[PDB]
Amino acid sequence: ASVYAWNRKRISNCVADYSVLYNSASFSTFKCYGVSPTKLNDLCFTNVYA
């Protein structure tokens, strides 16, 4: 989508494998501002907005 109409996907009621997303080398920027990238597979959240 465009940036004025960014698509919001609600991630909920599922188990999320952030290690596959983090170990991918195609991403040129992986910056977190409230959590740690290596502790995403350990913590639990109510829902994720993408």
Binding site: Y22, N23, A25, F30, P37
Partner: protein, 50 residues
């Protein structure tokens, strides 16, 4: 900008009490090994206050 004061942003493990780490070895922040060379998910551990 006074950039002479630095803190250890990245380390593999927590320190002991009264433990000092001055080792300027590279950190592996991803699955890819760094081999002492900066790159993708390879960051210097010491970053300066702005």
């Amino acid at each position: 900008g006074n950039y002479n004061y630095l803190y250890r942003l990245f380390r593999k493990s927590n320190l002991k009490p009264f433990e000092r780490d001055i080792s300027t070895e590279i950190y592996q922040a991803g699955s890819t090994p760094c081999n002492g060379v900066k790159g993708f998910n390879c960051y210097f551990p010491l970053q300066s206050y702005g």
